[PDB]
Amino acid sequence: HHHSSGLVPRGSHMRVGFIGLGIMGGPMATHLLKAGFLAAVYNRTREKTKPFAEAGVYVAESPADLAKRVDVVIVMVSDAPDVEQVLFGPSGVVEGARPGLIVVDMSTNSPDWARKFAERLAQYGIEFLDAPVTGGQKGAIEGTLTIMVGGKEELFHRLLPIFKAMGRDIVYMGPVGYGQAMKLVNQVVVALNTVAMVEGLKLAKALGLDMDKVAEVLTRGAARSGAIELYLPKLLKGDLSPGFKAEHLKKDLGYVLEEARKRGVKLPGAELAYELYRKMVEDGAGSLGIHALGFY
Amino acid sequence: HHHSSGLVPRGSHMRVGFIGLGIMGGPMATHLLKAGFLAAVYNRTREKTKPFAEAGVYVAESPADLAKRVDVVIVMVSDAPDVEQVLFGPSGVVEGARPGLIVVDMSTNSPDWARKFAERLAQYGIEFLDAPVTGGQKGAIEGTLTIMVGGKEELFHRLLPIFKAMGRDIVYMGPVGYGQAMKLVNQVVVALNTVAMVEGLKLAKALGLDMDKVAEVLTRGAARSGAIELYLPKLLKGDLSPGFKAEHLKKDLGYVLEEARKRGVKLPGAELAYELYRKMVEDGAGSLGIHALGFY
Ligand SMILES: NC(=O)c1ccc[n+]([C@@H]2O[C@H](COP(=O)([O-])OP(=O)(O)OC[C@H]3O[C@@H](n4cnc5c(N)ncnc54)[C@H](OP(=O)(O)O)[C@@H]3O)[C@@H](O)[C@H]2O)c1
Numbered sequence: 205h206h207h208s209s210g211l212v213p214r215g216s217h218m219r220v221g222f223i224g225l226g227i228m229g230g231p232m233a234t235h236l237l238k239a240g241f242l243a244a245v246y247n248r249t250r251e252k253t254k255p256f257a258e259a260g261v262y263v264a265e266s267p268a269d270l271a272k273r274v275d276v277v278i279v280m281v282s283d284a285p286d287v288e289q290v291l292f293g294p295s296g297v298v299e300g301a302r303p304g305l306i307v308v309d310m311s312t313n314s315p316d317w318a319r320k321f322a323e324r325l326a327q328y329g330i331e332f333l334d335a336p337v338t339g340g341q342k343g344a345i346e347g348t349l350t351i352m353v354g355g356k357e358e359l360f361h362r363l364l365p366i367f368k369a370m371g372r373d374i375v376y377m378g379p380v381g382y383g384q385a386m387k388l389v390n391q392v393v394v395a396l397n398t399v400a401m402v403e404g405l406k407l408a409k410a411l412g413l414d415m416d417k418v419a420e421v422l423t424r425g426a427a428r429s430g431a432i433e434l435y436l437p438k439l440l441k442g443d444l445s446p447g448f449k450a451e452h453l454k455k456d457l458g459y460v461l462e463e464a465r466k467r468g469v470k471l472p473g474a475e476l477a478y479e480l481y482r483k484m485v486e487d488g489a490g491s492l493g494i495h496a497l498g499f500y
Numbered sequence: 501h502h503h504s505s506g507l508v509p510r511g512s513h514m515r516v517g518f519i520g521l522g523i524m525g526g527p528m529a530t531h532l533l534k535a536g537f538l539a540a541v542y543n544r545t546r547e548k549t550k551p552f553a554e555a556g557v558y559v560a561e562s563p564a565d566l567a568k569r570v571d572v573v574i575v576m577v578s579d580a581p582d583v584e585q586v587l588f589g590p591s592g593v594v595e596g597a598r599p600g601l602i603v604v605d606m607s608t609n610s611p612d613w614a615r616k617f618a619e620r621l622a623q624y625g626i627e628f629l630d631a632p633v634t635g636g637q638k639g640a641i642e643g644t645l646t647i648m649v650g651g652k653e654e655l656f657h658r659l660l661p662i663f664k665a666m667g668r669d670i671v672y673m674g675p676v677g678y679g680q681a682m683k684l685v686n687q688v689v690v691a692l693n694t695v696a697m698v699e700g701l702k703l704a705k706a707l708g709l710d711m712d713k714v715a716e717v718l719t720r721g722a723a724r725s726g727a728i729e730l731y732l733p734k735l736l737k738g739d740l741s742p743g744f745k746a747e748h749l750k751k752d753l754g755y756v757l758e759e760a761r762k763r764g765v766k767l768p769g770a771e772l773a774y775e776l777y778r779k780m781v782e783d784g785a786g787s788l789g790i791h792a793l794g795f796y
């Protein structure tokens with residue numbers, strides 16, 4: 205069954221359908237639209253698709269309905285089970301895709317999961333890249349994300365224009381799962397950098413320091429970090445909103461620990477950070493930004 | 501007993517004597533010499549004073565001998581007991597200082613220690629500021645240190661030209677001990693940022709990632725940090741040299757934990773970092789840079 209034309213010509217072989225219009229996904233998809241690649245969106249909560257429909261983007265009834273109409277499906281949903289649902293569920297991408305479609309998972313999970321998604325997709329003649337990102341909500345909005353990619357090198361090149369719409373530095377990491385691998389490494393660092401900021405701030409408050417001055421000093425050598433630059437201003441204002449959700453970091457850390465166990469590496473800091481974030485979720489603060497640790 | 505003239509006119513009331521020509525002290529003192537403030541040095545190991553003597557700087561026989569010849573004594577020795585020795589030992593600064601001399605401790609210890617040094621010094625008519633620094637060896641060499649100062653505000657202003665010779669951003673934190681307080685806050689962040697880098701790198705190596713690419717990704721949003729910028733290149737090369745000594749970080753963290761205990765604040769990350777660095781010292785690696793944690 206063929207279909208009517210959409211925003212992006214078929215002959216481009218670059219029609220993109222985007223699944224998951226969240227804190228990251230909405231801005232990423234908007235950038236794709238600005239660049240002329242976005243044909244369609246799907247979001248579980250329909251209301252988030254409204255601003256896209258208002259710009260003429262096709263709003264799909266399901267992932268399958270989206271896949272049948274595009275050449276590249278980008279997924280920016282929460283966790284690996286969520287990716288499994290959108291790709292392999294009853295009305296998932298595989299039910300509508302044609303062979304040669306490429307799936308790009310830009311969410312964070314693990315190398316093992318990326319390899320599994322690729323293997324399953326391959327049965328349907330579907331290609332796969334894992335291209336998780338760093339730079340946060342701000343990067344997504346600004347289009348400056350650093351994107352780290354695993355998969356066929358030829359596909360990385362083919363899709364570079366698409367990645368460039370959303371990000372600035374686009375790095376090919378290696379075969380499938382190597383993007384998630386780099387992301388997990390990144391998350392160890394982000395988590396611990398965040399714990400570092402939160403603990404320093406707790407100490408600074410206990411010591412009665414002037415927060416204007418604390419912020420000035422910390423925004424430099426070499427205490428300074430991405431976590432501080434992205435989140436200290438919000439944190440000082442008591443804005444605990446994401447940002448990056450605590451539950452998502454907890455999930456990332458779990459994947460970090462699984463890899464570390466498999467490989468015989470001891471990561472005591474990552475283990476602590478996982479515990480702290482697990483507790484934050486348990487306590488009901490899973491939807492707050494990670495910068496709210498210790499302050500929720 | 502009056503003395504012959506030295507490099508810096510007495511009428512300036514800005515003659516500086518520098519005690520502790522280590523990784524930080526040598527470059528800091530050199531900057532003071534370039535700026536025309538350095539009259540004298542003292543170092544326990546005489547050989548380190550040679551490059552200063554070659555430029556005409558008076559090499560003192562003791563801290564007392566130095567103090568009698570200068571208006572400002574800057575101390576950049578290792579730990580608080582070392583400061584006590586140079587200030588209050590048998591031939592310490594107090595034995596040669598005249599009332600009105602100002603002591604500036606630029607080393608890292610604690611607010612309690614700064615207050616104690618000031619109180620003891622005050623008996624002799626000696627003024628005191630705690631002005632610890634951040635920016636590392638590189639900052640010291642480049643003259644770009646961020647300097648955080650506790651003490652009389654009037655003295656902070658008086659000494660600004662001196663601080664500016666060594667640093668760029670000079671921040672008045674508050675009364676005596678407030679400089680060390682900010683430094684301790686900074687150290688929580690530096691320690692955890694360092695653990696973050698080391699753990700990420702350990703994971704990256706386990707995952708077989710290309711270190712060129714790992715470095716590129718980490719040198720950005722928002723995994724990026726001062727620790728990464730200062731030390732990742734050395735670490736990738738296997739250069740474990742300080743930099744900032746592990747034993748010194750261990751000492752800083754101990755002071756952090758004392759304050760946290762006094763004030764009822766729980767800092768589980770700082771506690772872990774203290775344990776890790778304590779172990780590093782126990783293992784014989786106390787003189788390596790902090791970036792060598794996990795790799796020594
Ligand atoms: N936020 C950051 O700073 C950041 C940075 C880099 C990477 N990441 C990673 O990127 C991914 C998305 O993060 P985010 O911050 O955009 O999260 P978010 O704001 O929570 O958005 C999650 C999105 O996924 C959708 N979704 C979740 N489960 C689903 C399912 N089972 N079926 C269909 N749709 C589903 C949500 O739909 P609804 O709208 O219906 O809820 C929403 O569109 C996560 O893996 C996160 O770890 C986040």
Ligand SMILES: NC(=O)c1ccc[n+]([C@@H]2O[C@H](COP(=O)([O-])OP(=O)(O)OC[C@H]3O[C@@H](n4cnc5c(N)ncnc54)[C@H](OP(=O)(O)O)[C@@H]3O)[C@@H](O)[C@H]2O)c1
Pocket residue numbers: 519520521522523524525543544545548576577578579581582583585586606607608609633634635636637742743744745748749
């Ligand atoms: N390195 C960094 O990145 C950095 C950055 C900011 C702050 N700091 C802090 O700055 C201070 C100095 O650090 P550093 O890296 O310069 O250390 P360092 O290289 O180990 O130098 C220590 C200096 O103190 C002297 N010293 C130590 N104990 C002494 C004593 N009892 N009597 C007399 N002199 C003594 C040493 O003399 P000898 O030459 O005879 O050994 C040396 O000159 C430390 O408190 C450190 O925590 C360091």
